[PDB]
Structure 1
Amino acid sequence: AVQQRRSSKHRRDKRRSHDALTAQALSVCQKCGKKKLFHRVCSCGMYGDLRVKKAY
């Protein structure tokens, strides 16, 4: 169904301002640069186990 009026800016912001983003995990690399997410492979290959991957 629908009402007989419109929804102003304030109602939307009360809906939108609580849709705001949040923070994330982080992982400083202990052997290289290219700071990466936690529990994620750094973007320069050399990972803890080994260079499980590449830089690109």
Structure 2
Amino acid sequence: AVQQRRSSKHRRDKRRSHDALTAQALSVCQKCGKKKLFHRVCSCGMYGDLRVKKAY
């Protein structure tokens, strides 16, 4: 199946109005800088207590 008359560029630009991601959340760890995503581990391998992993 295919269209009869070709869709113009403005139809495409209208359609993709909703294909936009939702931004994530910035978070400042109490024992780590390098602002991170909320509800996950940090970059310094911590989570506020529990140095569970290294940085490697």
TM-score category of the 2 structures, normalised to the smaller one: 0.7 to 0.9
Displaced runs of 4+ in structure 1, greater than 2 A?
Answer: none
Cα distance in 2, alignment partners of residues 49 and 15 from structure 1: 47
CA contact (8 A) 1:25 1:37 kept: yes
Identity of aligned residues (%): 100
CA contact (8 A) 1:47 1:53 kept: no
- TM-score between the two structures when normalised by the length of structure 2: 0.77
SS in 1 for 2:12: helix
In terms of fraction of residues, the more helix-rich structure is: 1
- Cα deviations by residue, 1:5-55 (Å, 9 ceiling, x for unpaired): 111111111122321222112321111212110111001113224111222
C-alpha RMSD of the superposition: 1.5
In terms of fraction of residues, the more strand-rich structure is: 2
- TM-score between the two structures when normalised by the length of structure 1: 0.77
Cα distance in 2, alignment partners of residues 44 and 52 from structure 1: 10
Count of aligned pairs between the two proteins: 56
User: Which 5+ residue runs of structure 2 have no aligned equivalent?
Assistant: none
